[PDB]
Structure 1
Amino acid sequence: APQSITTLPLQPDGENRWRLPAGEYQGQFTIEQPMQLRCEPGAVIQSQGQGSSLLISAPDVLVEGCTLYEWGSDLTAMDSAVFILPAAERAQISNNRMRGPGFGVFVDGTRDVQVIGNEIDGDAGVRSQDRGNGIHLFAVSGARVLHNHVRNARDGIYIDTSNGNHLEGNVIEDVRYGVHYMFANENSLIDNVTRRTRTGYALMQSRKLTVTGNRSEQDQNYGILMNYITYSTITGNFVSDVQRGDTGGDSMISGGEGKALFIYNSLFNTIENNHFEKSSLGIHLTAGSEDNRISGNAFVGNQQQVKYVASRTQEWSVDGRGNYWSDYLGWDRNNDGLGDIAYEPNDNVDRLLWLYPQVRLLMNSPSIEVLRWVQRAFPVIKSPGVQDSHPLMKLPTEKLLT
């Protein structure tokens, strides 16, 4: 494992700023001094397949323009491409290309680290169980990770107990999990795009975080999975075409029929102005997760809008404004945006199918069509469900389809 001064850096400016010329290189490298090194686009720093390629241990390091290739795969010894120590405060990792079977950006104990504009192509042959994380963040306060492009890693952007950090505008393609959250209290993430992923957003046990403007295009079996999130904010997310599938490992989640949003034991959070489009399940509301502000979303094109296996009533409109539903066959007499009759998304026969899957054979029967009409005529047999007084008549998310 050589050092960065053992390379041939041509200095452009004498303020600890370096510039590596075009040409391939070899082996691991380690930063122990605050060197703001840049690189030409032909600086292919190609490791041999072992160790962390660019270890950083000094504060204020502006890594820029490198092109990393083929580092290690020992996930226990953390064979990363860019390892960043806790003493390496305010590191900038700008506009880099990475190709290797381990961790892309492993940081831990860091403050104000900036992982901006990188392209991290993970793997092609590994079974999405040893590919390593794209942008791993381990208990960092102050981080600023923006507009990267992670492809084919294992579980995308993993975040473990990191308090204050923004995730703005980064594209995540063909990975197991898109963005993983573990105990990340007071977080934030804006405008991210996740494509063709076995879970679009894993939000596990992290409170007080802001999930805003994010996009999920053609992901598998879990659009946004929220486990045990409290006092959060879900405003403007676009979850599109969550098809069925399986994660392949079944470690922390299970296989699903395709859910655009899965709320598991999340008590208080505001879920407004979202767009859940063309999935099998629009939103799954578990029995432990009640009394949270769910108002203003757009449940369009889903084969089943809400799954709520309970008998407790659940109003879905705060301040008198509800959600837009595509199958809402209602009218609007007084010309406001709201509908006039309330919308119950679930029947009693729509919850016998969840309790007993053998009722799917009886789903075309006239007696079931009688039983759908008996509930609309006799509301005593209607179990108290997941209704919303004043649902919306027009689409509120006219901008999220762009």
Structure 2
Amino acid sequence: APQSITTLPLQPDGENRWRLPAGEYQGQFTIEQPMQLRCEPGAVIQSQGQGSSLLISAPDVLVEGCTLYEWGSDLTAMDSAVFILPAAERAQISNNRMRGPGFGVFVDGTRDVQVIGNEIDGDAGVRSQDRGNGIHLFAVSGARVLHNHVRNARDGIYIDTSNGNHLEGNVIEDVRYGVHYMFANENSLIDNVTRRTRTGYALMQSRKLTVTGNRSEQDQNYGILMNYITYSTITGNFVSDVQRGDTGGDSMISGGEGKALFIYNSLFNTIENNHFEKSSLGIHLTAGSEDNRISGNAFVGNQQQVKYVASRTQEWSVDGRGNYWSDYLGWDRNNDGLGDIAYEPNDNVDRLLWLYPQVRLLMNSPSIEVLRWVQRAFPVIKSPGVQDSHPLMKLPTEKLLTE
């Protein structure tokens, strides 16, 4: 593993500057001095296949423009394209292109690191299990991951046991999980984009994070999976078309149903102003999530909008603001009274109002109307507990529909 003191330095003045001319630099490389390696538009570091293309082991290193190919395959030795050691604080990895069967950027407990504007690609030859993560973060703090494209590398970007992170603008495509995210307290995710994944946002076992402004496109099996996520400010998200596990001649009877929001055990959040659309289910609520504040959301075109299971009563309407509730059947007689009927969810009517969209007309007839008036007075179908006292007739989240 020769160092960057080898090859062609062409040093600019200031000594915190080492340019890099074009060419086929073949092998691995280790950074052991404070450097700012800024290279020309096209230079290629071709690691034949043995891993550890760049081992940054010194503080204050800034790598810009580099292109990396086929760095490694062995996950056991966590071979990556960039492997920032814990003592390489304040490192910056900007505007690099990386295509290899393994980790793209790996920060191992090094604080105040900046991974900006990197397009990471992975080969499709290897199976999804052995592709290797992208932008893996361990015990990191103060870091900022902005506008990094990662494609075809399992688990999108991964955060573990980290507190000081600020995430923005990531365009994650064709990965197993959009953001795999475990035991990461007091973080922040903004304006992320996950497409064609198998879990758009895995918000696991964490605390006091902000997931404002994110955006999940045609994902699969999950849109926003939240486990034990407390004291958070979930806002601004957009989840669309979370397809199920349907490949080949099979049917996962009573399973595999996609979910826009899988909210689990998360007692305290501030979920508001989110758009969940064209899903196979929304706001799946299990365990205990009392004291959570849900308002101003939008659920359109869902096969079943909610699957509340707890035996307690919880109103998702803080300060007279509910959710758009496409299934909501009629009734906005005061001009702005948000609604008179509380949206008591029925799973069966949700299925009808999605497959047959004209049934709303059929259920606005005065006869069916008085029947419903008698079915909201003498309960028929035991109350799935959720009930929005003040549902919404106008459709909010219009700003974030298409952006």
- Whether the 8 Å CA contact 1:247–1:254 is kept in 2: the answer is no
CA deviations 1:4-26 (Å, max 9, x no partner) are 11111222333321111111111
1:357 is paired with a residue of what secondary structure? coil
Structure 1's 356 and 274: CA in aligned 2 closer, same or farther, altered over 3 A?
closer
- Whether the 8 Å CA contact 1:135–1:158 is kept in 2: the answer is yes
Give the Cα separation in 2 of the matches to 1:51 and 1:249.
39
Give the Cα separation in 2 of the matches to 1:337 and 1:21.
67
Structure 1's 149 and 247: CA in aligned 2 closer, same or farther, altered over 3 A?
farther
Give the Cα separation in 2 of the matches to 1:253 and 1:382.
24
- Whether the 8 Å CA contact 1:135–1:156 is kept in 2: the answer is yes
> How big is the shift at 1:332?
2.0
Alignment: residue pair count: 402
Give the Cα separation in 2 of the matches to 1:137 and 1:248.
35
> How big is the shift at 1:263?
1.1
Structure 1's 248 and 183: CA in aligned 2 closer, same or farther, altered over 3 A?
farther
Structure 1's 374 and 182: CA in aligned 2 closer, same or farther, altered over 3 A?
same
> How big is the shift at 1:267?
1.2
Give the Cα separation in 1 of the matches to 2:265 and 2:250.
20
CA deviations 1:262-318 (Å, max 9, x no partner) are 012111111100000101102211133333111110001111100112332221111
Structure 1's 75 and 360: CA in aligned 2 closer, same or farther, altered over 3 A?
farther
CA deviations 1:6-57 (Å, max 9, x no partner) are 1112223333211111111111100000011101121111111112101101
Give the Cα separation in 2 of the matches to 1:395 and 1:364.
20
1:105 is paired with a residue of what secondary structure? strand
Structure 1's 255 and 316: CA in aligned 2 closer, same or farther, altered over 3 A?
same
> How big is the shift at 1:384?
5.1
Give the Cα separation in 2 of the matches to 1:102 and 1:23.
23
- Whether the 8 Å CA contact 2:185–2:209 is kept in 1: the answer is yes
CA deviations 1:322-359 (Å, max 9, x no partner) are 11111212322322262222111236998999999999
Give the Cα separation in 2 of the matches to 1:253 and 1:32.
56
Moved more, 320-329 or 104-113: 320-329
- Whether the 8 Å CA contact 1:246–1:255 is kept in 2: the answer is no
Structure 1's 360 and 390: CA in aligned 2 closer, same or farther, altered over 3 A?
closer
Structure 1's 170 and 356: CA in aligned 2 closer, same or farther, altered over 3 A?
closer
> How big is the shift at 1:223?
0.2
Give the Cα separation in 1 of the matches to 2:328 and 2:66.
53
- Whether the 8 Å CA contact 2:23–2:43 is kept in 1: the answer is yes
> How big is the shift at 1:385?
1.4
Q: Higher strand proportion, which one?
A: 1
CA deviations 1:350-371 (Å, max 9, x no partner) are 8999999999999999999999
Structure 1's 347 and 96: CA in aligned 2 closer, same or farther, altered over 3 A?
closer
Give the Cα separation in 2 of the matches to 1:280 and 1:272.
21
CA deviations 1:186-220 (Å, max 9, x no partner) are 01000000000000001110111100111111100
- Whether the 8 Å CA contact 1:59–1:90 is kept in 2: the answer is yes
- Point out where structure 2 has 5 or more consecutive residues left out of the alignment: none
Moved more, 84-93 or 244-253: 244-253
Moved more, 109-118 or 349-358: 349-358
Structure 1's 134 and 37: CA in aligned 2 closer, same or farther, altered over 3 A?
same
- Whether the 8 Å CA contact 1:311–1:383 is kept in 2: the answer is no
Give the Cα separation in 1 of the matches to 2:300 and 2:164.
34
Structure 1's 346 and 290: CA in aligned 2 closer, same or farther, altered over 3 A?
farther
Relative to the length of structure 1, the TM-score reads 0.90
- Whether the 8 Å CA contact 2:304–2:347 is kept in 1: the answer is no
- Whether the 8 Å CA contact 1:73–1:101 is kept in 2: the answer is yes
2:306 is paired with a residue of what secondary structure? strand
Relative to the length of structure 2, the TM-score reads 0.90
Percent sequence identity is 100
> How big is the shift at 1:72?
1.2
Give the Cα separation in 1 of the matches to 2:30 and 2:363.
64
Structure 1's 269 and 330: CA in aligned 2 closer, same or farther, altered over 3 A?
same
Moved more, 336-345 or 391-400: 336-345
2:387 is paired with a residue of what secondary structure? coil
- Whether the 8 Å CA contact 1:99–1:122 is kept in 2: the answer is yes
